[PDB]
RNA sequence: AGGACCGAACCGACUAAUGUCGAAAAAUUAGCGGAUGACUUGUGGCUGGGGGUGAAAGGCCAAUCAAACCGGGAGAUAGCU
RNA sequence: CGACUUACCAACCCGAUGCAAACUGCGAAUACCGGAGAAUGUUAUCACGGGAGACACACGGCGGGUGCUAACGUCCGUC
RNA sequence: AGCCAGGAUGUUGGCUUAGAAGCAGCCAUCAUUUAAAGAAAGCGUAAUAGCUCACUGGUCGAGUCGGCCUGCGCGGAAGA
RNA sequence: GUUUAUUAAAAACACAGCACUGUGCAAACACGAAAGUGGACGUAUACGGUGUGACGCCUGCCCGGUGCCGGGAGGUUAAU
RNA sequence: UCCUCCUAAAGAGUAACGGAGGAGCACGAAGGUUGGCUAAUCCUGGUCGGACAUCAGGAGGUUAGUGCAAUGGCAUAAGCC
RNA sequence: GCUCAACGGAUAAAAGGUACUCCGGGGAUAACAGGCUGAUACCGCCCAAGAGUUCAUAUCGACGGCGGUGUUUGGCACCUCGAUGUCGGCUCAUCACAUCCUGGGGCUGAAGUAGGUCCCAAGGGUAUGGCUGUUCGCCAUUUAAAGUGGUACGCGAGCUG
RNA sequence: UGCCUGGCGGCCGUAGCGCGGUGGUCCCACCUGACCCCAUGCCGAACUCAGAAGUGAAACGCCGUAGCGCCGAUGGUAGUGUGGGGUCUCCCCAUGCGAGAGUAGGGAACUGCCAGGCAA
RNA sequence: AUCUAGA
RNA sequence: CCCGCAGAAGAAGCACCGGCUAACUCCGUGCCAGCAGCCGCGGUAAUACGGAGGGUGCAAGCGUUAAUCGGAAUUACUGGG
RNA sequence: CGGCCGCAAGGUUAAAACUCAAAUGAAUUGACGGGGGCCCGCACAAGCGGUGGAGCAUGUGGUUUAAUUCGAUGCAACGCGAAGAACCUUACCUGGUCUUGACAUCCACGGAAGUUUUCAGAGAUGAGAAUGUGCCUUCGGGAACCGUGAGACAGGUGCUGC
RNA sequence: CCGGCCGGGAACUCAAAGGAGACUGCCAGUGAUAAACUGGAGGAAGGUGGGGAUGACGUCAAGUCAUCAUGGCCCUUACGACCAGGGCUACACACGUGCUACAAUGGCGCAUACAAAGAGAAGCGACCUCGCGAGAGCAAGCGGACCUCAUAAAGUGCGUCGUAGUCCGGAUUGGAGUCUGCAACUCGACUCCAUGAAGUCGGAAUCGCUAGUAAUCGUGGAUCAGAAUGCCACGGUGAAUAC
RNA sequence: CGCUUACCACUUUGUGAUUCAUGACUGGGGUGAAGUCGUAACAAGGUAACCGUAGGGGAACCUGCGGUUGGAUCACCUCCU
RNA sequence: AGGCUUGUAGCUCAGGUGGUUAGAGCGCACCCCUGAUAAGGGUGAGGUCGGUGGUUCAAGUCCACUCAGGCCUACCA
């Protein structure tokens, strides 16, 4: 499965209105091969279409069919918000991120946990001077200690020092996963500007050129309702070339 | 000139050691702060106990103070020892 | 809207087998109330009157709650 | 129970032709030679090979193997 | 500068300065059953109280609550 | 404070900050008496009507009802008219 | 005529602080320390699917089981309230061994050098500084090694505070 | 006294359900009609009256059959009073009492008082 | 109130 | 510094070509690749990018870069506001 | 920033890196003003009947499909191109078939054109069988048609109305 | 034989040709004694009489390369050509223009009146008969001022229904038809019989219209074998309003 | 010769002045063929704009006080000029 | 750890006490205004009321049971 996510680039009104019409294109493509498409979030534009539309597509090998659409898509047409009638060039950017499911974020294995019970500091009287009532727990494979020294009994210090320990293994993992989301998305989502990045869509000539495998399909009605079979297929051939 | 500076008398009491049945019911020895001032001091007054006085700590009021001391109600009361 | 099949869960009834302090179509020993009969017991029994103490219990046997079928623990019953 | 003994075959199986053959799965789990033995447990393989095993003969030659009811023991069992 | 004499000398207290408020003098307020004395032989540039604490840049919004103040209509209301 | 069950050891009684639940009312009739009656839940057939309204029959025999918590009861009925 | 409901009802009518405190008492009842216990803690053992290039058992071992010690926070409140000075440091130690080093072995997924792990062994040895009152810990740099503990988490009629 | 039938019982499942037949001269159940006594939260279905033509169907009774209930030993086991014992949160021994379940089986009742019909 | 970016 | 010898024999690149600036068309790409002193070219028919042909400048040199002055009467005294 | 000045707010004196090939002044022709004046229009006001609600006809978008041909898409597209889609038209799809071709000129040979008829196939088509062999004379040929051969090509309702 | 059907006649209606006609010609006022405006006469008509064609320089990088033509590019055993079936008519919906209605100034039944403009030969098609009706048989005429479509309808008279989702409305459907065409299934039009739904003047907004206009009523043509509620034209009746 | 004295070079400590690097964070500036919030300015720019200064405000800004024309409309009332 | 109090449309809240019926603002969908967007105007849909089980004729409500969020308390030693 995959996350198809189309952010609009240059031409912030027009390419919003066009990112509507890439989302309808792969929308028309996923309905052809019978895949579930679902708009998880959609920031609408000003005059139609979207500034970003991240929509999970599930199905049967969605990622290998659609991993080649990440990058820019430069759009030559006369716009809708054009009262002088000249050509304007814009761009949309697409990313395709794979499914990547979840596993249990803490392994709460207390055989890894060095439980350090020591004497409390602060106030208490003769109780502080003698009872320990303070606990460091050290998750050894991660090196995250947390010291809970809150209450008089050490048990309600220890259960707290296992709750906050579990939440810090959980948040310190979720920053690795969430760190690697935008680490890869930035590399795939281009700079947004029209320097050609992985296709064109040239409506006055009627032509489509994917820069790699310099295809020169003149279709543009056989592309704008799915039917990009001839678009993708030589790319997967010259991707199984390596 | 100065609630100015350094410093004895003088007033005080930040620090350490000694002393803790001591030389002393708060001292000594070596240092220490103020030292013409809102200073300090002699002698005589004046305020009296739910009252005094307090640059205010519940501090001081005769070695006693979150209510003096003495005599009385009184042989209080004591489910406590 | 005719209808469709199933690698699939499963009510009642049927047969077999278990559990229950707050289940009983069964049901003890003991205990308790009552009457009859000896024997033994310095009337041990009861009612009324004077004087109290005491109302902090503890462990061990058994039947239990509770606790971890922990405690020289804690709470009951009986000895 | 020992011991110079013997202890295969097509089945390099077809089968998932990536190897599996006795030795990662499927599995069927025939039958020959027969004094007798299996279309098979474990190592070594990349799998082979290689070392072995239940069984069958000689001689030696007498009991031998494994359970139940049990009695007492042993280990598990380390402190200031 | 002052401070718990006899375990605390400080960041506490006080201070100059600022503000709010009360007081028209037989002053408020205080000590006094009371006469009376202080305030002050002073009179609002004076005096008492409360907070804040030189100096510099400043001191925002809330009158619902609890006070204080002004009002006096209507209701309730004492002795009579 | 009170009611019901269990603990509570087959009379009664019996503790715990033991386990579970209710009460601080209702009713001039839901009281009395006489007379009459018998459920719950399923199945079959049936107008809209339905798994669940009313009908008829059958199975079943108190799994119902009892003004309200639980125990004890209750067809001679204490339940219904 | 009373949610006199704290329901055998003290009033017709009543909230708090005291680390400024005081008195009468109690170890009838708490904080420290000892005790009995062992939930918790730490340390062993059992079975074994797996992890280890095949291989359960060099090494780890899930789901579950059985015990030891009296160190931890606890349970109980048995001793002490007509007083049993309570943390850390300093000086001084002393025992246990479940050994950190040194000494002897077994296995190894042991070529060597170096290791891992397990058994025996307590004779001696076992840091110096920064930070924090700190124990603990983090860090720097050593070392053959920087052991875990009992001793009122030893030691104030020895010191400090 | 031999056999029916009705009432009132005793008794309370060895007695009650099933399944199979069996009776109508009386008795009983049905059944006929519903002026009127009387009734219907509608309805002579039930309750009440006046009857007998018919039927033994339904019920009621009787007889038979184990398919079920049901009753149920003997012996053992469980518990357990009292006294001792242990390898103690549970067992044992001596001793007294002794279940429940299941088994062999038992079993489709017995019995009075009166009244009517029969054979005597 | 606003009307991006290719004479 | 002179003769012989012998054979056209041993001897031409570099920049530019849209306006400024002398010198043009075709093909290749299609805001890409790229150029550029400024103005600006390339968005499918490019005298501006790359190659060909042709031309233009200069020449054993040609171009870029760097530095100075000039044009800049854009530091003005000559010679400005 | 540094100095000086100020109680402060601040003032005064006064740069640099960097960025862009512009910024500016006046004046002109327009366009625009929720600036002015004068006019105009079914523009409003004055009246009449409607659309939007219903049902259908028709066009369009959207969606669907194998194809739902292509174009027009404020005013100035939407009963428009279309003054008329069963077939044809038809350009679209599915399936069958053809390639100098359904369409024209050349070159070469052959074969009058024309009629009639049968078999297969959805049909295009192939496979045939009859039938006539006439209009001018180089008469190895003319002129109307027709089949084969390759090449010059024909063809395109393919693309750009930027 | 009351039929402009016959003799006949050239008045008139009409038919086209040529001509006259209206030009601020006339008058008064008013105005810079100027253009011009208001009113009045005459006049069928009054001041561009009512209508139409006729579209300046330019504006939209407007529309069409699919009417045609052409630059460029492209395919040229294909995107070219032929053939049969399908499609351009699909249907969760939205928008535009229309047609029919919601009724009683109306529906239905009968009798009856009053036009213009057109089209017609591999056409229009009488007459007569048959069929309930679309239509079918023979068929006269006419390339037409004569013959044919072609009964004009709203109108008027007389009944009738009495405000009902109805004798309103006509969708939708079922059955039988008829025409044209080789062919009516997707997908034609029209008739007959049964069917009889949504609909009771329509939200916010919104359009056309100043006179024979709006509104309403019927008719004809092109396209065309058939197939319009569209387009193009024609006449009937015929308003309110502008301060 | 030696010794000594004064002068003085390297060198060493003290505290500064300056410039050059460097610095967690921070203030404004510039550019960017797209973003968010508004519309402050250009017409009387829809409240005339702008200068100084003060106060407030998400921001352009808004408001006060003074000033300038580098501001438009003036047969709309009314009529005397 | 207890004790008290939230959970209702896509978001923010009433509705809960008081047992029988689900609303508001914004958002969203559709149609007008507009050259076009915003604003605006007209029309509309949208909930098993945090999941679980009882009582009751009936659970959004009433009692347990939790789950996610919030505040308070957690002291003398």
From Swiss-Prot:
Residue ranges of the region described as Disordered: 175-204
GO BP term (any one): translational termination
Ranges in a coiled coil: none
Portion of the full sequence shown: 110 to 351 of 360
The protein's name: Peptide chain release factor RF1
Localization terms from the record: Cytoplasm
Modified-residue entries (N5-methylglutamine), positions: 126
GO molecular function, a single term: translation release factor activity, codon specific
Major subcellular location class: cytoplasm
Record keywords, A-Z: Cytoplasm, Methylation, Protein biosynthesis
UniProt modification remark: Methylated by PrmC. Methylation increases the termination efficiency of RF1.
Role according to the record: Peptide chain release factor 1 directs the termination of translation in response to the peptide chain termination codons UAG and UAA.
UniProt family annotation: Belongs to the prokaryotic/mitochondrial release factor family.
A cellular component term, taken from the record's GO annotations: cytosol
């Amino acid at each position: 499965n995959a996350f198809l996510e189309v952010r609009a680039g240059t031409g912030g009104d027009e390419a919003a209105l066009f990112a509507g019409d890439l989302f309808r294109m792969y929308s028309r493509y996923a309905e052809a091969r019978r895949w579930r498409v679902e708009i998880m979030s959609a920031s609408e534009g000003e005059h139609g279409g979207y500034k970003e539309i991240i929509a999970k597509i599930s199905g049967d090998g969605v990622y290998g069919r659609l991993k080649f659409e990440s990058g820019g898509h430069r759009v030559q047409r006369v716009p809708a918000t054009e009262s002088q009638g000249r050509i304007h060039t814009s761009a949309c950017t697409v990313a395709v991120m794979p499914e990547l499911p979840d596993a249990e974020l803490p392994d709460i294995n207390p055989a890894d946990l060095r439980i350090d019970t020591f004497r409390s500091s602060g106030a208490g009287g003769q109780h502080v001077n003698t009872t320990d009532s303070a606990i460091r727990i050290t998750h050894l494979p991660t090196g995250i200690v947390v010291e809970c020294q809150d209450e008089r009994s050490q048990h309600k210090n220890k259960a707290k020092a296992l709750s906050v320990l579990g939440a810090r293994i959980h948040a310190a993992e979720m920053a690795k996963r969430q760190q690697a989301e935008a680490s890869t998305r930035r590399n795939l989502l281009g700079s947004g500007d029209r320097s050609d990045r992985n296709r064109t869509y040239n409506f006055p000539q009627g032509r489509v050129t994917d820069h790699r495998i310099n295809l020169t399909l003149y279709r543009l009605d056989e592309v704008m309702e799915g039917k990009l079979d001839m678009l993708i297929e030589p790319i997967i051939q010259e991707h199984q070339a390596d």
